[PDB]
Design a protein around this ligand. Structure first.
Ligand SMILES: Nc1nc2c(ncn2[C@H]2C[C@H](O)[C@@H](COP(=O)(O)OP(=O)(O)OP(=O)(O)O)O2)c(=O)[nH]1
Ligand code: SF4
Ligand SMILES: [Mg+2]
Ligand SMILES: [Mg+2]
Lengths: 868, 186
RNA sequence: GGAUACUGC
DNA sequence: TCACGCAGTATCCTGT
């Protein structure tokens, strides 16, 4: 009778079914001795509201204070007589609860005796500002059903749940294989200490064609790779896919080249050939229903894939669209909205993994296109099928099979990328730590995770959480640097988890600091008890520390090490966001005072540390909000380390939880400007020996808005400047290289790929009012004018600057690389690249180096040294 | 034209708007954006060449406790653009009195715009008194200002300051003011 | 004055 | 229905 199942996703519809939450997941069946999909419908999640009594009766805010003391009986009587009848509430259950509160609503005491009213969700909803004669405020009027369920039942992330006395379903309500109905929320509980079960995964890739007349994208091929036992707590399985299925549909006009029958016969029997897009979509829906994946992964799934899928299903009136999801519904969700919430609802109950979002969150790359992602992660080359050749490929069996295999290879690449980054296990870990739903975690963003973390933390500790919403302060301190070149060891001292440690040490929390609805609040007293925000922060920090210890294990696999590093980064970011949300205007926990205070304390700390270093008669040359660079003025590494230790201890002697550590020993340093420098980090191997690794921070060479050519040039220059060669020789070499570059440009020998400049779009192409002045936007517009996939906000665009005889400014002469390769009037504007890409960068890298000045550099490149 | 003589011109030929802008510039060695645009366009109109204007602005701003390289980094492009050297590369004409009156409205800390329109009557009276204008002339200028015909007020200023009974020209451009003053004097 | 980028923590 | 904070460097434009 007891139903034990692992829950993965939850879906609620606030408008159709009030008080119903649809949990989805896996259940164990002995008859098939396997795991099957299950859908449990929790019903009757009653609304709960909290009424705050007044200290003195007020005559409906007309006569003001009357002097009559108010007790819980008065509040209950007022609610039963006036409010209930007025707002059409039939039946409710009321009790008294002593609850604490510290947030941004004034006149609400720290700890008060609220009246808790529980009534069904079918009744109307009380207004937020409802004020009577005995109660001054109402909390929880617009709380969602899923939030109430998760917080009341203390459910945090995917886990094992036990249901007592489940009930069957009168009629089918889901496409799963097992169903159950819970008539109360108290019947669901969480059982700890059990392993996650395997979850099916389907990686899908689509290939379409734009029919010009309708300007609508038509699907011509789909490929999918399916794994039935993908783990959520172990390494990815090798190979990453078990089975596969491919479907290919003839266009509305073209016909097969009278050999597709033989081609498919001799190739394989797993390819399904259909004649009309309706049949293709129907077969895809049937296959999805049969396989029943818990995770569907793809590239641009939220943006293009699922949107086009739903659009084509609607256009073709393909029966049983709800198969795409897991719940059987009649009316399609409205097509539109921000991000992919409509797409998420269309696929309700199925986790969706867009490798673009996960790649943006986890790693950093110049471009997040599939080709670049495959190049940077899998280290492989992906061929590109031109958009204009897919239509023409319906002229030979070989070409059509090649197109289908290209789709298959794209699906395989997507699955491999998913496996490499550990997207799924990391998503599970983050979701468990925070407490949100997994789909929300995989949709990206940071606000929701911290929101749910603090929600759980406060609810567990008997608090009333706020109601969901319906350069503003000083930050860090950047010390003025002593720009130059340093040929001696530079000791970098960095604080460990600065802001989290500040929150812990000084006990900064909602319940500790006294805010007043733009001045820095005073530090909380030291006689209090640690709040909720500090404790949570501590937990996160400890997690990170443990991961770091794992990373420190000797003789560890490279790949695994990298994974651990990623994990560490994630956790760090989580903590930092737990700080940053405190100053997020649209956050559920906006506490700008607190955040300000945090930053202020950080500044103070840095100042003090600098002072101490100077009191030790050392030299301080840079610091960015938690760090100090010290010019050791020595060449004996051991001695440097000794000094490190010494100062380290000294600093630590002033703090309890804060700590400072040696973040690196630079053999040489080239400090150009605030947050722009390069160095040779010293990694010690033992016996006094050490290796050197080049490190760059903020230089144009590590920026994506400069032509690769220039970047490489600068890199070479840096390698020359940071070495130990005699300065004169260094300069000579630099000159030589620059001249080489000049020649390579003048003869046009440099590969075209090196002439590209990449830039991202913050808005859509149309919103920019400077379509002419902004080059990248121009290119985007051209792309959208062409007959291929459109470019939208967040999509990086690569462009080249060329010559056309227009005699316009460079900003107006941008062109797509393909365009340059196609048109017979466009040639690369050598001059520009030599004058505004290589020369600036190099000059800024050579500013503090004696013997090299702008003029000279220009000369070495063949430019005219007059206007420089 | 020489930079040094520019100050001299500010004594007589400069219309009151440019006089106010120049006084503020020499008092503080810095102008908000509107003042920069207006004064740069006017100095372009009088004839200050790109090299001359660059030198003047460099020398004036360097005294404001800013890095020398910062000027070439930031304001050089603006100075070039005023002379149609970059961007669309258009020989932008000097502001017309109609534009100045209907251009960006000055606020606290600003000194651009037409003083006759953007100065309170008491402030305009004080300024006119400061320039040793005869009491009758100051009263006449104030009366014209109250009539919303600020261009006529500037014409009266020109008549009084140049010791000419009638201006003889319809003042509709600050460069016209400077040209008429130069014609009368030189 | 404004607009467009992306580094640092 | 959404969306972490702030400090800092680099480039480019201002007609109807
Ligand atoms: N809100 C926010 N703050 C950040 C972020 N990254 C860094 N910070 C701030 C808060 C950190 O405490 C402070 C110090 O920067 P660090 O890179 O040295 O990180 P932290 O000291 O916390 O840890 P670590 O030195 O890597 O062990 O900078 C971020 O992504 N978001
Ligand atoms: S009327 Fe024209 S020239 Fe005279 S002060 Fe006003 S803006 Fe300057
Ligand atoms: Mg740190
Ligand atoms: Mg400014």
């Amino acid at each position: 009778q007891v139903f034990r199942f692992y829950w993965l996703d939850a879906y609620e519809d606030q408008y159709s079914q009030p008080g119903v939450v649809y949990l989805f997941g896996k259940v164990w069946i002995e008859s098939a001795d396997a795991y099957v999909s299950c859908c449990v419908s929790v019903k009757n999640i009653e609304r709960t509201v909290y009424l705050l009594p007044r200290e003195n009766r007020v005559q409906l805010s007309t006569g003001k204070d009357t002097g009559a003391p108010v007790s819980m009986m008065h509040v209950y009587q007022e609610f039963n007589e006036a409010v209930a009848e007025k707002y059409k509430i039939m039946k409710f259950k009321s009790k008294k609860v002593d609850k604490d509160y510290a947030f941004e609503i004034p006149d609400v005491p720290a700890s008060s005796e609220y009246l808790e009213v529980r009534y069904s969700a079918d009744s109307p909803q009380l207004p937020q500002d409802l004020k009577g004669e005995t109660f001054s405020h109402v909390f929880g009027t617009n709380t969602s059903s899923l939030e109430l369920f998760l917080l009341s039942r203390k459910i945090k992330g995917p886990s094992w749940l036990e249901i007592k006395s489940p009930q069957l379903s009168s009629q089918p309500m889901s496409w799963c294989k097992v169903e159950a109905v819970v008539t109360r929320p108290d019947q669901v509980s969480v059982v700890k200490d059990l392993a996650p079960p395997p979850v099916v995964v389907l990686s899908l890739s689509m290939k379409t064609v734009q029919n010009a007349k309708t300007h609508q994208n038509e699907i011509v091929a789909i490929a999918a790779l399916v794994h039935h036992t993908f783990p959520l707590d172990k390494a990815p399985p090798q190979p990453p896919f078990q089975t596969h299925f491919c479907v290919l549909s003839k266009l509305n006009d073209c016909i097969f080249p009278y050999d597709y029958n033989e081609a498919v016969k001799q190739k394989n029997a797993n390819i399904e050939i259909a004649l009309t897009e309706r049949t293709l979509l129907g077969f895809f829906l049937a296959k999805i229903h049969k396989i029943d994946p818990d995770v569907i992964v793809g590239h641009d799934i939220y943006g293009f894939d699922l949107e086009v899928l739903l659009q084509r299903i609607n256009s073709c009136k393909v029966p049983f669209w709800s198969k795409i999801g897991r719940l059987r519904r009649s009316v399609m969700p409205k097509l539109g909205g921000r991000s992919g919430f409509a797409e998420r609802n269309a696929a309700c109950g199925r986790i969706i993994c867009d490798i673009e979002i996960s790649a943006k969150e986890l790693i950093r790359c110049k471009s997040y296109h599939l080709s670049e992602l495959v190049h940077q992660i899998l280290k492989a080359e992906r061929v590109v099928i031109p958009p204009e050749n897919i239509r023409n490929a319906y002229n030979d069996s070989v070409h059509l099979l090649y197109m289908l295999e290209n789709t298959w290879i794209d699906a395989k690449f997507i699955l491999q990328i998913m496996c490499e980054l550990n997207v799924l296990p990391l998503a599970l870990q983050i979701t468990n730590i925070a407490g949100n739903v997994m789909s929300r975690t995989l949709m990206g963003g940071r606000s929701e995770r911290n929101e749910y973390l603090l929600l759980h933390a406060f609810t567990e500790n008997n608090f009333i959480v706020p109601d969901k919403p319906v350069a503003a302060y000083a930050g860090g301190l950047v010390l003025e640097p002593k720009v130059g070149f340093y040929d001696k060891f530079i000791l970098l001292l960095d604080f460990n988890s600065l802001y989290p440690s500040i929150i812990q040490e000084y006990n900064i929390c909602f319940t500790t600091v006294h805010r007043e609805a733009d001045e820095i609040p005073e530090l909380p007293h030291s006689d209090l008890e640690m709040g909720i925000l500090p404790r949570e922060i501590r937990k996160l920090v400890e997690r990170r520390r443990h991961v770091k210890q794992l990373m420190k294990q000797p003789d560890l696999n490279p790949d695994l090490y990298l994974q651990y590093d990623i994990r560490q980064k994630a956790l760090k970011l989580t903590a930092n966001s737990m700080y940053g949300c405190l100053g997020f205007s649209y956050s559920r926990f906006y506490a700008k005072p607190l955040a300000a205070l945090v930053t202020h304390q950080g500044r103070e700390i840095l100042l003090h540390t600098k002072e101490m270093v100077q009191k030790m008669n050392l030299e301080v040359i840079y610091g960015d909000t938690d760090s100090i660079m010290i010019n050791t003025n020595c060449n004996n590494l051991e001695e440097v380390f000794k000094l490190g230790n010494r100062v380290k201890s000294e600093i630590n002697k002033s703090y309890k939880l804060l700590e400072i550590d040696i973040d690196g020993i630079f053999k040489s340093l080239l400090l150009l400007k605030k947050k722009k420098y390069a160095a040779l980090t010293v990694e010690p191997t033992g016996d006094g020996k050490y290796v050197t690794k080049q490190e760059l921070k903020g230089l144009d060479i590590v920026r994506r808005d400069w032509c690769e050519l220039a970047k490489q040039a600068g890199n070479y220059v840096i390698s020359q400047i940071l070495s130990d060669q005699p300065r004169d020789s260094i300069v000579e070499n630099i000159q030589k290289k620059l001249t080489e570059i000049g020649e390579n440009v003048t003869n046009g020998t440099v590969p075209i790929t090196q002439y590209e400049i990449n830039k991202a779009l913050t808005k859509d192409p149309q919103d920019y009012p400077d379509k002419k002045s902004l080059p990248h936007v121009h290119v985007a517009l051209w792309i959208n004018s062409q007959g291929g996939r459109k470019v939208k906000a967040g999509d990086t665009i690569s462009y080249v600057i060329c010559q056309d005889g227009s005699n316009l400014s460079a900003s107006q002469r941008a062109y797509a690389q393909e365009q340059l390769q196609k048109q017979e009037n466009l040639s690369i504007d050598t001059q520009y690249y030599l004058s505004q890409q290589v020369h600036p960068v190099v000059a800024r890298i050579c500013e503090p180096i004696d013997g090299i000045d702008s003029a000279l550099i220009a000369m070495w490149l063949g430019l005219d040294p007059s206007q420089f | 034209i020489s930079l040094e003589q520019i100050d001299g011109f500010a004594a007589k030929s400069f219309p009151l708007c440019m006089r106010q802008l120049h006084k503020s510039l020499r008092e503080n060695h810095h102008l908000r954006h509107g003042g920069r645009m207006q004064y740069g366009l006017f100095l372009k109109g009088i004839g200050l060449t790109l090299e001359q204007a660059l030198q003047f602005w460099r020398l004036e701003f360097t005294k404001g406790k800013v890095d020398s390289e910062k000027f070439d980094k930031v304001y050089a492009y603006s100075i070039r653009h005023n002379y149609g050297k970059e961007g669309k590369r258009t020989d932008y004409t000097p502001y017309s009195c109609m534009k100045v009156i209907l251009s960006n409205p000055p606020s606290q800390g600003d000194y651009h715009g037409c003083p006759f329109r953007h100065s309170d009557p008491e402030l305009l009276k004080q300024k006119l008194q400061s320039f040793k204008v005869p009491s009758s002339g100051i009263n006449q200028i104030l009366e014209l200002v109250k009539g919303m015909h600020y261009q006529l007020a500037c014409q009266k200023y020109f008549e009084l300051t140049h010791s000419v009974d009638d201006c003889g020209f319809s003042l509709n451009h600050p460069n016209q003011y400077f040209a008429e003053s130069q014609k009368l004097l030189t």
